[PDB]
Amino acid sequence: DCTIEGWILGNPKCDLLLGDQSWSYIVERPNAQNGICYPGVLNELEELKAFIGS
């Protein structure tokens, strides 16, 4: 239901992912609606996604 932005920023509607976590690959749904709530620009967001994928 969210994006990576709202996930690592901590949107109160994406709190299912939390604490100490581990994975091998991340799946993001296309029609998500819970991203950046307070409007703004996340600088170097593409590089952030690339660094998170690793």
Binding site: L45, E46, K49, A50, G53
Partner: protein
């Protein structure tokens, strides 16, 4: 199968509104590699079947 096991890894990173050029470069590189591998495999298959039936 041994000489073909070398995998070419390629994932599409996110590219911004102002990264049209890097996105086009990525697309062209991946499409060229795909074309090269496809052509090589297909023509190798054809020639190998030819010479195999001949053998």
């Amino acid at each position: 199968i041994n000489k073909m096991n070398t995998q070419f890894e390629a994932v599409d990173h996110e590219f911004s509104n102002l990264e049209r050029r890097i996105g086009n470069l990525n697309k062209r590189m991946e499409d060229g590699f795909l074309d090269v591998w496809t052509y090589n495999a297909e023509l190798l298959v054809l020639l190998e079947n030819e010479r195999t039936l001949d053998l």
